[PDB]
Amino acid sequence: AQAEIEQELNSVKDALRAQVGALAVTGAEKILGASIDANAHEQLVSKLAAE
Amino acid sequence: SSGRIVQIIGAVIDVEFPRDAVPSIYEALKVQGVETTLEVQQQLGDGVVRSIAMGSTEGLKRGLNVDSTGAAISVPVGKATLGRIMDVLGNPIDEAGPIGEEERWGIHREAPSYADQAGGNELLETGIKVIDLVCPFAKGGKVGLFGGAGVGKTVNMMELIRNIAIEHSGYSVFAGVGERTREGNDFYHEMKDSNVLDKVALVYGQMNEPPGNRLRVALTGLTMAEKFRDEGRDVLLFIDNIYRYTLAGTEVSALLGRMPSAVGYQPTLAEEMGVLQERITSTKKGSITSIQAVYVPADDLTDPSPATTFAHLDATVVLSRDIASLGIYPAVDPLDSTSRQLDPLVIGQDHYDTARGVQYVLQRYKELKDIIAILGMDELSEADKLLVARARKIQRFLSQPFFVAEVFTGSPGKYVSLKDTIAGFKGILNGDYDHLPEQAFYMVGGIEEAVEKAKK
Amino acid sequence: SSGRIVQIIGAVIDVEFPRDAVPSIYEALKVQGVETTLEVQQQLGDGVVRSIAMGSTEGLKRGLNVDSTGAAISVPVGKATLGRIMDVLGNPIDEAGPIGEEERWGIHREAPSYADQAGGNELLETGIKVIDLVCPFAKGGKVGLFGGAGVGKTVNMMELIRNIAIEHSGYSVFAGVGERTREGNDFYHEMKDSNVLDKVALVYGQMNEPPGNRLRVALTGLTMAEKFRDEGRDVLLFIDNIYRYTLAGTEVSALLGRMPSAVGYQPTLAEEMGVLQERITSTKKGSITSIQAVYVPADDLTDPSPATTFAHLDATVVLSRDIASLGIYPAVDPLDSTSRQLDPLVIGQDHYDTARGVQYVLQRYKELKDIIAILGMDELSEADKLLVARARKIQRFLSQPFFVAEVFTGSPGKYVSLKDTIAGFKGILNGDYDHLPEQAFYMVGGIEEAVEKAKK
Amino acid sequence: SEISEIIKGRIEKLDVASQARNEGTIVSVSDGIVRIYGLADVMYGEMIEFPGGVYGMALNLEQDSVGAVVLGEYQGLAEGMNAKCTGRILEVPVGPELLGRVVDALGNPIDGKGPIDAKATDAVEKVAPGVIWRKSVDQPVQTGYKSVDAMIPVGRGQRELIIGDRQIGKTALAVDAIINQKDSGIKCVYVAIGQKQSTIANVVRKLEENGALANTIVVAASASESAALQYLAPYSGCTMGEYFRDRGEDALIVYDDLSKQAVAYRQISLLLRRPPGREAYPGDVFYLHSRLLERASRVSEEYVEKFTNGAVTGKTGSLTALPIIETQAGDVSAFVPTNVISITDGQIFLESAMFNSGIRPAVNAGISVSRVGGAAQTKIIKKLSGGIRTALAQYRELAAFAQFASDLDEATRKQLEHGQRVTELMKQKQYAPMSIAEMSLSLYAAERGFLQDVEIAKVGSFEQALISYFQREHAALLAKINEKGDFNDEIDAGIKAGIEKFKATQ
Amino acid sequence: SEISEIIKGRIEKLDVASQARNEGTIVSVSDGIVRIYGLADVMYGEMIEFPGGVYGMALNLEQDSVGA
Amino acid sequence: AELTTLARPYAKAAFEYAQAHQQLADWSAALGVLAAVSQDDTVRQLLKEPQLTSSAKAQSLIDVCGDKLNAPAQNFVRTVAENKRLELLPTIAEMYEQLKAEQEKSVEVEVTSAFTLSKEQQDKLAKALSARLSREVRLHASEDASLIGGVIIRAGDLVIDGSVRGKLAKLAEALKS
Ligand SMILES: Nc1ncnc2c1ncn2[C@@H]1O[C@H](COP(=O)(O)OP(=O)(O)OP(=O)(O)O)[C@@H](O)[C@H]1O
Ligand SMILES: Nc1ncnc2c1ncn2[C@@H]1O[C@H](COP(=O)(O)OP(=O)(O)O)[C@@H](O)[C@H]1O
Ligand SMILES: Nc1ncnc2c1ncn2[C@@H]1O[C@H](COP(=O)(O)OP(=O)(O)O)[C@@H](O)[C@H]1O
């Protein structure tokens, strides 16, 4: 019983952690899109030729 | 988008869709004009899908337009399904009009995870001497009625339904898979006349229906039971014959482009069986108690289909043609039947010793039978002559008149309790009835009725 | 020139070569940058060849370069192979460095022609009494060895290996067809401890190797034996199990897609056995004699594998668990063991009459032993009791201390000649030794040694 | 309380650069086999990456397409989806961190106890140690059963087959053999192939109720899981067992159904359209089980010093295997049973007729055999098992005379009752493993004639009471025998005095 | 339908005609059976001569090839 | 079997003849025209009639193409018809170009950027791709509005992805694994 309650607590922490990450990544996609088009389009194309 | 039929061969149909609109595996398709549903089984390539008809193909032609539904077969679930008869597609097959569904589930689903399984040993009493003695069932456990043709699978299941479902406080699902249409009618009128139809959902797919119907009827009935289990309820699931699900896969496997395996079976026999059997289980939310009848081709228990089925069940009840040929019913083999509950920790030492005592006497009689046939009975020891007399009494005390079998026998039915069964067999093994003739124990009930029968 | 891998399906690999450089059937190919050898099985046409990997195919990919070697799998031959363990390709599996080879021979060749056969039947004097009397071996013959484990099979092989080298100036080759890695290590140490390792070449095809390796190991060991025969020697070829050679052929035939024959064996069953067995013969230079262990599927002697093998056997040696309990360590059964050379038109009237005399007396004693057991020793006639006494003396005189068994017997080894073997048994049959105790005829070698062992 | 922001700090330290990848496109999907176009550099056995975190393995590298099998669920994959080479073969986590955990065929935890902390990974498909790196089997592996440990002994590095029909104790014998290792030093591995999930949970619940779970790794590939996972599970479990052997230690592995692994491999083969043989199995079904079972072995001190690079010295490691096979109506001549009977070092045959006659362990000692034999036994069990063999052999010969015991000759009647009392001694209970000293009391008592005045029906209560007596008044002697299973004239006289004293008052 | 014995990269009909009715070329070899292209006048049961003194017997006369 | 498997002998025959007679461009044009004509709905139907002989079907395909087939290509069309393989002409045409491309030491690359087309960008990537492949590169640029920013380069089975959408995929799997 002791082990079952301790692992239940860490399971709730890791389950919410996965959803929190997914929502943070969704925000990052929008954030990136504005600066990525002007500055990053030339930097990405030139960097890929060096890679 | 829209597709065109390109190839019809028996129950299998190929439909070609735009290469950017190919429907998913197990996706349901609808033919234009004709009222027919096709389930995608394979994506051959180049926008073509291979599907099986959920109806007849006599009216189908090459070039008919087919529509993609974007999902798998969705059947109605919940309280609206109780007291109704339905087909594989979930359509009502009774004249009571439409069903007031508030939700539809897809017949295809994942099995509960390893962390969701639940373990319980609550003993469930059946009222049958042989079963209550050697095959004690458990609440939430899986039972299998193994047997060939004409030995009692349907009759025994009906008796259990009567001795359990009628008293059961929860709901129930009855699935007739590859069953005779006459048995389905008799059972419907029986549930209706008994006023128990209100707590039983009925799904029927009989032998007159296309292979695709008999291949998915089991998933439809199980989908309704899973909705009730997931609500936290205790449910009973009865399947008339789960072999018809395997056979429908054998009938269609070769037309699906699959090479045959041993005994002309589909190469996917063990996986197709595991995918169905792992969903029929009792999780931590609610408990499904299930009874399945398992047909044994040509009475051979080593046939790949019966042989692959034993590992999926908790209680295995075996019916023997040699016992039925002697006019003894229930025709249960007490040496081939087994249960996970036949353990001293679960049933007690007295019951366990009585069951093992009965099995020891019957195994010893099986090896003395040939001696008696060739040489004769006088050439046996005094201990063997006494053991043969008791073995023949035990073999007849396992017969029982059933309430669902009165039309076949003319004799009234009987319900024996577990206390009475143990007492009657313990007495015969001990010698308390070595004066009564073996005919006094044939078709009676409790041990007192053998004592009364002997006098007459 | 070189080709390219075009297809990989398990152990079966297809390679494409230029139209002017297609490799021959049975030619060995080398994959660049990986230690993998391919034997060519069929020429599919259009430059593509079908081959079987002689190793694992894990990590291989399409497009890798492959080189033709110009000849079949070529293995080291001669004196340098003695006291060494090698794989199917002739590589030193023992961690003892490279083999000091002076020449290499291809594993595939025709059997010696009709003109190359020897001018008669010459017995191979094993120096073992029971074998030289009841199971006479012909030079260039094939001997089937039957029996279970723990009955002296290994000790009997080591004694034969010692005697051919010390008493006849010959050599031995052991082919481990489907060898168990644990038993292969144990046998290597037992021969090192028994000082016979420098008289034998060891070729092992372990059970975990692909089907192609297990099929070709018998030809690798046979190629090493052929070299010594050409030197002017009489050679012993031991085949660990001839049934596993047949099964490896069945496995390869299924991988290549050929249509199976009766009882599921390969269609080439008799030809594959004939190609191996016809090289083992007595030529005009030397003679390869073979001892082959035989396994019988389902105890059925009519099964295609036993049936085909028995067609090429000249003698059958049966080792008995019962005889071993008596204490006769050689453990050869004088009644069940047989030889085609046991004919007066081959071994002369004297050897034949002496051997048949021993078998008659031992047969009568086995019948009398049941009488003595059921009714008692007093029930027998005076002539029958005299026979029982001679039979017991004969039975013990069939025993012999082997030089490789000094660790078990605590006594020095003996090499009895055929002349001494015949004279000893002829005397006991005639009654010249009826005054001596039976024990005096146990573990002694020649008949003069029984006389002295009795004197003390 | 707060953890999501710190685990994200690490995610901002991961590679965002382009990488050259070799790709292909899905052409067809059916029955768990996805056929791909492209992948010109994929290797035989490499893992393919599909959309959605689904992985596959390449098995048919044909000229115009790649036939791949899904290591998971394939009903979400579709025509036109992208497929990518990984450059890697299949590998699983390995080490002591797996002990007391339940994992899938890929090493993922299914018990819900949290993530595994394994410090290394290893390849599922590997070659077995060669001939010259092995050492003869001469150390015992006690199963706790008098019938097995006395007559069919198993040694460290041996492969002993458990063979017989359905529902006769095959699983019980192997689980009890694992339970008996909790104090021995042998780590244990149980591999479940094609079993239902609730059955695997009853074995783990029984390993926990008996204290054996903390010493066991449980690998599961249940009946609803992909045939590729059921085919690979024995190799994954073997790889986890090989960690301890290669590092100088000892391990035990149970393959609960090699016949279900063969059935899963047959499904994949017939669906790839490989040429069929007897019972529809592919041409390399013998090589499937042989490649697995030849890894169970004992390796020499020089192999362990070479592998450990000197770290471990003077120690020989081993992996012992107990494969299980089900026969149909006693037919041992079937294709898969014939292959495995020929690969293994010995066989334990269980019989339905013996099991129904009350002989619970059901071991047919007349046909069961261990080729390693007496080398896998301690000195005390090797001395007391010789007569037990003779008495059972005599009982098999004289079993028809029981109905005529009066008419028998006295010598034969003496042998008959001895045979019947030794036969009743072999009967044992489930989850009741016996130690070397406790087994020695029972075998000594029967072999030295201390059962001639005990009714064949009281032999069991006599055994149970005798062990209980020695556990109270002779605890020092039982501890002495349990050190190494040694035997000498002081132990022989000590056991005799205790049995004589037991009969004189108890 | 699958590939047949005549369908090879080197069987190039550059000239749409025919010549040499008594000679052919070995197309494939397997377990003692040979496929030959071009023997237009071979009779059923006729002896076929190969290099190094080897002989074959004609058993399958097809549109595109001879089986021996 | 795969159409590629059935078309491999015919495509290789065309290539090995074309190479040995300096006709690698004539056959390219002929195979491309034959593929197109055969795909037309009227010609498709004509080629699947049970009444016409193999020679009649072959002839009809040569008359529609005319001057576009040289004598040798005309003989090849008859050979394909005699063997009943006229449904494989599009596949034979595709495989012929692949053999020719490896011979000329060239690759038809399929670059897909996030909203950009420029000579300055193309020549900056084409030198590095040419150097890495050790071949001449025939870029076939296009637009992929799906991408937030960057480019995906497809050459053979090799796929060099440097798009922000690829960085989002990597970031998503890392959190759930
Ligand atoms: N001493 C015993 N040894 C073994 N089994 C016993 C014993 N006493 C009782 N049994 C019972 O016999 C049955 C054996 O089941 P078990 O699962 O071990 O058999 P199995 O042959 O492996 O069955 P299955 O084929 O389903 O896997 C169980 O109910 C077990 O509890
Ligand atoms: N308990 C029983 N009592 C009497 N007759 C029985 C009984 N069980 C079966 N029978 C006989 O067999 C028939 C029942 O077979 P059924 O239950 O339909 O078998 P199955 O489903 O195995 O084919 C009855 O019609 C009757 O003749
Ligand atoms: N000639 C012999 N002399 C004495 N003992 C022998 C002899 N042959 C066999 N044995 C006994 O039998 C055992 C097994 O013999 P072995 O040749 O190894 O048979 P197997 O190879 O089948 O195991 C030996 O270890 C020894 O105890």
Ligand SMILES: [Mg+2]
């Ligand atoms: Mg019925």
Ligand SMILES: [Mg+2]
């Ligand atoms: Mg089991």
